[model samples]
Each structure stands twice: as structure tokens, then as C-alpha cells.
Target: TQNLGVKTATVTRGPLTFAQSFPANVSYNEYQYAIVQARAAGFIDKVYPLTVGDKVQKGTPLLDLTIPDWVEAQSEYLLLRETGGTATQTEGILERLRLAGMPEADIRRLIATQKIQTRFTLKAPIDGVITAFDLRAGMNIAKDNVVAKIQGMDPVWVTAAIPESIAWLVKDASQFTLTVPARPDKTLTIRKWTLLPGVDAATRTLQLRLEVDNADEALKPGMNAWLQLNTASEPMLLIPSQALIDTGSEQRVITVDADGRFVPKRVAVFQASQGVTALRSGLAEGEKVVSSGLFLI
Candidate 1:
């Protein structure tokens, strides 16, 4: 019997992996930043406007206020009511009244009753939550002072610090395939990714940001994550990285011929990763690859 040598390797099937490993940390995309501060200050009579976590819509009433400016604006808006139908510049006056923080109901009443009230009702300018506030029934507030804060929480922001060495591995439009231990059954898709302008001086790494739809409210800001970033590259033949044996001068692989004789043939190498290598000209599919304790030879 002839002695035939064979290279040994643990073969696995699935999507042939060429994965690169890097220690990754988890985070929510950073786009959902918001603040909830009171627009006009006054004693906290009531905050019907919203609670710390209440979901609010645009124009939703937050609180009611009693102020001198509010009262004066009310009177001015009342005078413009008469011009709504007869005045040539009625639209302009109405627009100005609206911009002056007059509510739609007040504008309508001014046009109907021609009366402006000093009392003001606070409403949300945008859809968000009341994150914070410092007011009670009789607390004093100032102009543009924050009595409460609000924020939107639909698209959550996830910011991660990527090492400077692998900074070139990703781009603003880089797509990442993530597998979180929390949700192991499904693979989450991060369609859009962005890199911050510059690397942090302290960390010496690039700041990568990714926005994910947190509609279900499952992911929080500081939760752990396992990210599988897919780096794009040109198509190349792939094989087990250890398949080729270093005989002496040239790179070669032990092959089994039709007569079962093992022969070392030279192979052209291209790229390699994760114990796998892409061959330029060496082997074909379905050909029995010799993988055993052939190194003993």
C-alpha cells in the first residue's frame, strides 16, 4: 500500500465565514436626544401638559399660565378679530397673532367675540415627553426659563466607540448586521450608520453612530449589544486558511490523486481570515480535500 498524506482541519458548513473579531460594546443610537423645559415660567399650578414619561403630541396642552404679557397679547389679538372679514391685511394680522403664542381656540374666539383673554394655556410645540421640571402651584418662573423638559423617543440613537486601527473598516453608510443576546432568534438590521466628524482625543478612536427603530421600546440607552459589522470587499475564492502546508520553498497542499496517491501541489494565495483563505488558483468545489494528520510526513 502507498502512503498518502492528508492535511487536517475541522470543517464547518453554513455561510462560509471570513469574520474578523473585535471587542464590541452595545448602545442605542444617539439621535433621540431631547430636553423638556418650560417655555414661560410661573408657579406650578398644574402640569396637565405631561408627566415625566407621558407621550404627548404637538399642540397638546401642558399647563395654564397667568402673565402680564399674555394678557396684553390677548387684547391686541382681539382688536385684529374685526379685520378678519373686512380688512385687506386680515391674514397678516392673524398670522402675527398666531406667532405671538396665541392658541388656535383663542384666535377663533377673538375673531368671533372680538375679546382677548390674558390667561395662557401651555401646549407642546413638538411631539415629545416632559423629561424634567421644577415648578409647583406657586413657583416663580422667568422668560425662556425651563420649568419642564420634553423629548421624542421613536428612533433611538446608538453610539459606539470604534478603535482607530479599524476606523477605515467602516463608513458613514456602512451597514451592520447585529446579533444581540437579548434577541437571539432574530437578526436586527441597521440600515444606516454614520461616523462622527473626528476621533476623540482621549479615546483615540472614531465615534460611530447607528439609529435603530425602537418602536417596541425594548432597547434602552445603555444596554449591552453584540454587533456583526459586514465589511465590503471584492469577491474572492475562499478555503480553510490552514489548508495549505509549508513544505520548503513554495506553498503547496497535499492532494489525493485518482490512484489514492497524495501529492503536494503549489497553490496561489490571495486573502485569508478567520482560519479561512481565498485561493486564486488551487482547488475546485466537490474535489475531496485531504484533511488529516498529514503534517507527520
Candidate 2:
């Protein structure tokens, strides 16, 4: 074995940098926020002139609803307040109205006017584009009924499924850029990057999330996007890629000791990039590794 033509290389310990890119799908930043629901069971008195795909600003009128029960509750509270009712009794009525989904502003208006308010206008909670609605005059709306769906477009979420080998590098990257193929002329810089705490077993990839600004309405939800991230170099023992021996079960390398004896050592590889393999453990630095002629050993 000593007479065999074995080429040996010294194991070097240093930082290794890796850069990778991945494909991702754009999604709404807020998953459960698109749907607007009716707070109380009531009949729609009037529907707003807005329709699907209409961009609505915050506080825009959505629909007018009237609930007779709400009027009765307001009147009862007014009567109790007018009488010698205790503060605790009035507070209980306030709490009941709050639980009934009465807006604080509307409740305050009722107190100020000292009158019953049977009709209330629902307004847009945020600036978003109306995606769906079936509201019409005289429509009976139950509590928690979906009045409409307003998908926000200010910031969009991009879901990236990264390979397990490079997943750890992404977690350390604070930001990345998303390039949409549909809008190839535009390059979106995403400042917020988040790694979800789960693995996709079907694809065997780690899921990552990035929030990109879409105030211009350029990056729509459900669009395809690409992102590239770079990981800083980390100090690790590296060996040549040619030195690894695949044993059908695990990978090992031939280690030459000071005594001139060849030993096969099993090493846990962290990553392999650009002809260099990062070893997690097993072999120490300054050890001699057989870079060529492994079959003879």
C-alpha cells in the first residue's frame, strides 16, 4: 500500500461561503384577514356601490345593516342611565354591547345622542382590494357571515421551499430580493425573511417566508417569484470532494496517519460547495487525506 501511487492533500480549516437561489410563490401576507364578516345578525339595509376588484381605502363604507335587537339594547341602556342606575349596572350594559359586536365609536355616539341606533354602517377595516361579496339590499346577514373578502396589497408574502442542504444558510440571511418572472423588469427587495418551523415531508424541503412591499400593486398574490440568498463564510474543516468514498451506506475518506497507516474514517459532512466539502466532525485539521488513488487503499 505504501508503494502505491497515492496523492495526499492537507486538510485545511477555514471559512467557506455558499450562495444559492430558489423559486418561491407569492402569497398574501396575512392569511386569515382577507374575509370581512358581519359582527351581528342583522339585515342589510343598503349595499355600498363597490364591487369585486374595487380598491377600497380604510374607513370606506361597505354596507349598512339594521338589527332591531341592537336598538332595544341601546334604549334599555339609555333608560337605565337616565334613572338612578348604579355605575356597575351601566358598565354591565356597556360590556354587553361590546360583546354584541358594537363598535366603540358607535356606542359612544349612542351615549352622546342618548338615542337608540338601529342602523350601523360597516366600514373597511383596512386598505385592500375587494375580492368577493354578495351583499344586496334586504339580505339577512348572520353573525360572523362573510360580507366580503378584501385582500390587502400593501405587503405580500412569498413562500420559498429551500432544499434541506441550504436551509440552514437561509435562516441566517436577514433579507433577500424577489424577482417576478411576469414582471421581469422589476426587482423587489424584501427586507423581512422568516423561516417557518416545519419541514415539507413531501418535497423534503424547508419552508421559508419573505415579506415584500407591493404598494404599487405590481407583485400580486399567487405570482411566481425567485429569490437569492448568500450565507457568510463559517470556519470549518474542509477536504477535497474527490477524497470522499461512497460505501453504499455512508461516506468516508481515507486518512493517512503519522505512522504511514491508511485508515478509513467516517465524517459527517455539513455541506459541499465549489469542490470543497465542509466536515461537521470526525477528522481534525492538519491531517493528511488521500485525494487520489483511493481504490488501492
Q: Highest lDDT, which number?
A: 2
Best-performing candidate as measured by TM-score: 1
Model 1 scores a C-alpha lDDT of 0.58
Give lDDT per model, in order.
Answer: 0.58, 0.78
Would you estimate the TM-scores of all the predictions?
Answer: 0.65, 0.63
Q: What lDDT tens digits, residue by residue, belong to model 2 across residues 127-182?
A: 77777766688777786998878877667788888777777755454536567779
Off by over 4 Å in 2: 1-16, 31-35, 74-99, 111-115, 174-177, 231-297
The candidate 2 region of ten consecutive residues with least summed lDDT is 169-178
In model 1, the runs with Cα more than 4 Å from the true position are 1-18, 21-44, 49-51, 57-61, 73-99, 125-127, 138-143, 171-175, 181-185, 232-251, 255-262, 266-272, 278-297
Q: Kindly list the per-residue Cα lDDT of model 1 for residues 137-182, writing each as its tens digit.
A: 7567765666555656666555666777665766544346555556
Q: In lDDT terms, how accurate is model 2?
A: 0.78
Backbone clashes for every candidate come to 24, 0
